[PDB]
Amino acid sequence: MTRSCYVELIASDQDVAVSLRTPFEILNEREYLFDTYRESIEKLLAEIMFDKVNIINQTTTDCFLRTRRSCIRMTTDNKMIVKVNATSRQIRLENVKLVVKIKYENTIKTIKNRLMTSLTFIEAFGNLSQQIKE
Incomplete structure (x- = not known):
């Protein structure tokens, strides 16, 4: 578990999978x-x-x-x-023992879809960052 990605590995006796x-x-x-x-x-x-x-x-x-x-x-x-x-x-x-495909992913999401748009100040602070440089 990291600050940006959650990497998981499910290992069975025959097949091993890695997800992120x-x-x-x-x-x-x-x-x-x-x-x-x-x-x-x-x-x-x-x-x-x-x-x-x-x-x-x-x-x-x-x-x-x-x-x-x-x-x-x-x-x-x-x-x-x-x-x-x-x-x-x-x-x-060469000399490959095992090949594993990594599956990459992506009501909490239904609220996260709107609450990110609730804070529209990335573009405002981008305008301010362009503004200060004078």
Whole structure:
């Protein structure tokens, strides 16, 4: 749980899923990334490798990591690392043990739809910020 995103990981014996709930435009603006989210997901998929070894003991395969995906891969020194394809293009990686798609999200919302518009002073203070610079 962070100040901007709530990252969750549901791990079963066969399928592992990563979700990310944020109340904003999710992948920056359209399909980009902030560094902190990538480091947090990398830490989480690094810890679940050590904690859930037998679930991730699968055959090493070569696959193209697609949009909104992550994978757990083996390095040349038999060290397991994690790369998340938050880039726009698909990333080709080898020695992949597991591919996990990340599901990104977004009467409390019915009140939040109006109370944000109740405070119309972002544009007023933007005019003031343009005004002071003289």
